[PDB]
A = this chain, B = another copy of it.
Amino acid sequence: SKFDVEQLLSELNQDEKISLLSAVDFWHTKKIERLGIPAVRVSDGPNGIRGTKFFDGVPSGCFPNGTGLASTFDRDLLETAGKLMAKESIAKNAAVILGPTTNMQRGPLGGRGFESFSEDPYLAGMATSSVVKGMQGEGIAATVKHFVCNDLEDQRFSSNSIVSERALREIYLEPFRLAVKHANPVCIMTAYNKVNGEHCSQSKKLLIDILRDEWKWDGMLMSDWFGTYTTAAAIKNGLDIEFPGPTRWRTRALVSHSLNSREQITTEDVDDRVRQVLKMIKFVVDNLEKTGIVENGPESTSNNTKETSDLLRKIAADSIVLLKNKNNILPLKKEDNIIVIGPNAKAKTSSGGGSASMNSYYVVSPYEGIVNKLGKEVDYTVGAYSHKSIGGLAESSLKPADAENSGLIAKFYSNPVEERSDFHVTKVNRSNVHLFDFKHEKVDYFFVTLTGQYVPQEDGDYIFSLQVYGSGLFYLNDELIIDGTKERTKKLTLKKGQVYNVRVEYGSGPTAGGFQAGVIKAIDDDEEIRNAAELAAKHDKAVLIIGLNGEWETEGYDRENMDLPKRTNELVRAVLKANPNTVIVNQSGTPVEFPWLEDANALVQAWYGGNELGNAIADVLYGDVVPNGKLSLSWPFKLQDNPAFLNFKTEFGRVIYGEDIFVGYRYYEKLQRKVAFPFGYGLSYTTFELDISDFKVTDDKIAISVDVKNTGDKFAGSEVVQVYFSALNSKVSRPVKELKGFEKVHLEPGEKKTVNIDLELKDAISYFNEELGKWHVEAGEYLVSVGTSSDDILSVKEFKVEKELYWKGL
């Protein structure tokens, strides 16, 4: 190693020390050439590596979203995914990934519920631990986020999560505990919200008492972006580095003046934070030979290979959960006469919105995956629209027809169209132009002239669209058609083949920024539903693709309800009536109500599948991948059944975690409230059976062997063995049972394997004793329940525990 933390700490002067406590820009820590300390690049996010730009982003591999990844219940595969994320990161020259995410879906409506793993803390913690192992094994630093209780988006910079120490310990801190214990993440990012009255990013209890004194974790803490709220407290209380730069709270003047005036912090506080930042740079520098990361290096698409594609396709396929399949409707045969219908059928809903999304090398739509599978054109009808806003203009705009004449051209200007006599130019491929992290020499106010030609493909009405932050004007054929803002629309009649001129005059956010101009073919909503029904009736099978998208589920706001959008439900009822052998494929990051569920004979949950989403869906539907995912989340019938129904809004600045330890399936089992599909549920195209085949308990370990067998005679497949524990005679209220182990096993038809699950008792059966402030292994009788979902328990074993244990730590 050429990197010595303590030596450096002893050589840095005070100004240099202060300069290490904030990032330079959105993505980079501070270079100190004098001492051989490089700038380190970080990059979002948990489902693929975006790089240093949103607008004009270098393309990258988008992975399935977190709740889909967790539904694999496959540690090895999750490790493989983190290794591939590392390779994706190296290709962007980012030494640290801002992921994975592991907040908790205590209710279903969280705007970032798609982005984390699981309502279960053991599944969330092992998924986290597995991704981090895979990232860090390649020499790339993980950042587990957001610590802690950032479990909804509403007013997140100020929201006070008010939560008991028992629920804080057992549910919210637990996946971080597990990640730390098993994977040692190099970084953790603090949340935006408060916990019990105190912003996480200056909470000594969280940042120091727990992470440092109790858990002995020696990583680096960074703020979420702008999630610092004081100068001195955050430094005293354990926040190692403020992002993004340029610093707001930690200028040289603010910090040294606090030091020199004996206001709250000491030079020792500052050194403690600089020391953690140096340990993080030490990991990066020690790994440079292995990763090849170039300081301030170029960003490329070099990881866009067949190997990456096939692995993304596998990870997406195994994420998929088969929820219903009556009458052997699935698998489809390639000779089936089918029509594909639905608002998501030709959509590319690769991810949810915001920080975790990106510019992909490509996304295969579900329709394209089915055309690719069948090797021919497939009958289609859209059925219904379900977009939140109109986009699609850049994606369908331009003589030549080239894939390089494709889109719009953006020409940036110093002054307005209203006053220019007669600096940056960019080929725009997506209608949502997101200028937040945009930078140029001639900018801090700037203006944009967005141009191209649009050619309608059908005769009739088209609805043109524009949204801005916060100035623009939309021109078609040099006539003004449309004057953060609401969506404003103009409907106009056009003609197939005819070329129109699109011109958007935009002014920057002070007039950061952003805008979207879109267009869509208008339809008759009633007629298109009748048409899909009529068509579905005339085919053997229909495949109906529905769901939400990255505008309904997005960082920045929570969902208002659990409904499917617009006329989706009406569409589905009409199609099911016209053809009962319709398979429904749903894309969403979190649950949606299916009111017609009783009539749906085949139903597949695909999540948001990333670049290969549509091929993975085709793989499952045709049986080339046998469905093998299980729900990482409870799927209640109705929003009102959920434990957080009444407290999932920031009100008077707070959110009371009223259900306490009873989150997700812990709530439903305790109430005996029936759900549409429970935690851990998923079907296959084959049948399995299992039995505990050996069992052994000591004073400190539990060892379980489980034989699993594929009893079908046609498909090979994987089953997920899930191991739950129950206290049968505790003095303390607990959930009916708790997931503490799982193993995934692949089995040829007729094949049998034995899997082994070994755990310390303290891992299996502790609850957090709030009054004593300690975890407790309580003497008494316990049950281990082994099954293939939280309900489908197939084999059980009773055992006694005589030796008590109180513990803290890992």
A486 interface residue per 8 A CB criterion? no
Interface centre among A199, A226, A263, A653 (most CB of B within 10 A): A263
Does A673 touch B at the CB level, under 8 Å? no
Q: A199 to B261, alpha carbons, bound, how many Å?
A: 9
CB under 8 Å from chain B, chain A span 323-374: none
Set B254, B260, B263: member contacting A248, Cβ < 8 A: B254
Inter-chain contacts of A158 with B (CB < 8 A):
260-263
> Shortest distance in angstroms between A258's beta carbon and chain B's nearest beta carbon?
7
Residues of B within 8 A of A232 (CB): 230
Q: Binary interface profile of A, 249-266, with partner B (CB < 8 Å = 1, else 0)?
A: 101011001101111000
Task: Report if A465 contacts B (CB, 8 A).
Answer: no
Q: Is B160 a contact of A263 with CB atoms below 8 Å?
A: no
Scan A172-202; emit 1 where CB is below 8 A from any B CB, else 0.
Answer: 0000000000000000000010100001000
B653 in contact with A257 (CB, 8 Å): no
| Whole-angstrom distance between the Cβ of A500 and the nearest chain B Cβ | 40
Residues A263 and B199 in contact, CB atoms below 8 Å apart:
yes
- Given A248-B254, A254-B248, A229 and B263 contact (CB-CB distance below 8 Å): yes
In the complex, how many angstroms separate the beta carbon of A190 from the nearest chain B beta carbon? 13
User: Does A385 sit at the interface, judged by CB under 8 A?
Assistant: no
Q: With A230-B231, A230-B232, A231-B231 in contact, do A157 and B261 touch (Cβ < 8 Å)?
A: yes
Q: Which residues of B lie under 8 Å from residue A653 when comparing CB positions?
A: 262
Complex: A226 Cα to B232 Cα, angstroms: 17
Dominant secondary structure of chain A at its interface with chain B? loop
Once the chains are docked, how many angstroms separate the CA of A192 from the CA of B260? 12
Q: Report Cα–Cα, A158/B263, bound state, in Å.
A: 7
Let me know if A226 and B257 touch, CB within 8 A: yes
Q: Which residue of B lies closest to A155 (CB)?
A: B262
Q: Within 8 Å CB of A248, what residues of B?
A: 251, 253-254, 257
Q: How far is the CB of A232 from chain B (nearest CB, A)?
A: 7
Q: Mark A453-494, 1 if CB is under 8 A from B, else 0.
A: 000000000000000000000000000000000000000000
- Per the bound structure, the CA–CA distance linking A253 and B260 in Å amounts to 24
Given contact pairs A248-B254, A254-B248, A257-B248, A263 touches B226 in the complex (Cβ within 8 A) = no
Query: When chains A and B are docked, how far (Å) is the Cα of A258 from the Cα of B158?
Result: 9
Residue of B nearest to A156 (CB): B261
- Interface centre among A158, A229, A653, by most chain B C-beta atoms within 10 angstroms, is A229
Bound Cα distance A158, B256 (Å): 12
List chain B residues, Cβ under 8 A from A157.
260-262
Query: What residues of B have a CB within 8 angstroms of the CB of A229 in the complex?
Result: 257-258, 261, 263
Could you mark each residue 557-576 of chain A with 1 if its beta carbon is under 8 Å from any beta carbon of chain B, else 0?
Answer: 00000000000000000000
Q: Chain B's nearest CB lies how many Å from the CB of A511?
A: 14
Residues of B within 8 A of A258 (CB): 229
Judge whether B263 and A230 touch: CB under 8 Å.
yes
Interface of chain A residues 692 through 750 with chain B (CB within 8 A)? none
Q: Which residues of B contact A254 (CB under 8 A)?
A: 248-249
With A and B bound together, what is the CA distance between A232 and B229 in angstroms?
A: 10
- Point out the residues of chain B lying under 8 angstroms from A263, CB to CB: 158, 199, 229-230
A249: chain B residues at CB < 8 Å are 254
Question: In the complex, how many angstroms separate the beta carbon of A266 from the nearest chain B beta carbon?
Answer: 11
Per-position binary interface string of chain A over residues 262-291, scored 1 when its CB falls under 8 Å from any chain B CB and 0 otherwise: 110000000000000000000000000000
CB nearest neighbor in B for A258: B229
Residues A627-675 near B (CB distance < 8 A): 653
Docked CA distance A12–B272 (Å): 43
Least CB separation from A652: chain B residue: B262
Distance from A534 Cβ to chain B, minimum over Cβ atoms (Å): 53
Question: A251 to B263, alpha carbons, bound, how many Å?
Answer: 19
Within the complex, the shortest CB–CB distance from A215 to chain B, in Å, comes to 27
Q: A685 CB to closest chain B CB, in angstroms?
A: 51
- Bound Cα distance from A653 to B258, whole angstroms: 13
In the bound complex, residues from chain B placing their C-beta under 8 Å from that of A262 are 157-158, 160, 194, 653
Measured CB to CB, the closest approach of chain B to A747, in angstroms, equals: 53
Contacts of A192 in B (CB 8 A): 261
> Separation in Å of the A557 CB from the closest CB of chain B?
15
CA distance A260 to B248 in the complex (A): 15
Q: How far is the CB of A480 from chain B (nearest CB, A)?
A: 28
Between-chain CB contacts (< 8 Å), 25 pairs: A157-B261, A157-B262, A158-B260, A158-B261, A158-B262, A158-B263, A160-B262, A192-B261, A194-B262, A199-B261, A199-B263, A226-B257, A229-B257, A229-B258, A229-B261, A229-B263, A230-B230, A230-B231, A230-B232, A231-B231, A248-B251, A248-B254, A248-B257, A249-B254, A262-B653
A sample of 13 more A-B contacts (CB under 8 A), given A229-B261, A248-B253, is A157-B261, A157-B262, A158-B260, A192-B261, A194-B262, A199-B263, A229-B257, A230-B231, A230-B232, A230-B263, A248-B251, A248-B257, A262-B653
